[PDB]
Structure 1
Amino acid sequence: YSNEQEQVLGQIVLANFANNEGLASQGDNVWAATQASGVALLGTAGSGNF
Structure 2
Amino acid sequence: YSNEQEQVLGQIVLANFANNEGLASQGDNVWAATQASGVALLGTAGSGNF
Q: Normalising by structure 1, what TM-score? A: 0.83
More strand by share: 2
Regions of 4+ moved over 4 Å: none
Deviates more, 1:38-47 or 1:25-34: 25-34
- Sequence identity of aligned pairs in percent? 100
Instruction: Deviation per CA, 1:13-50: give whole Å up to 9, x if none.
Output: 00011111111112333111111211111111111111
RMSD of equivalent CA atoms: 1.2
More helix by share: 2
Long gaps (5+) in structure 2: none
Q: Normalising by structure 2, what TM-score? A: 0.83
Long gaps (5+) in structure 1: none
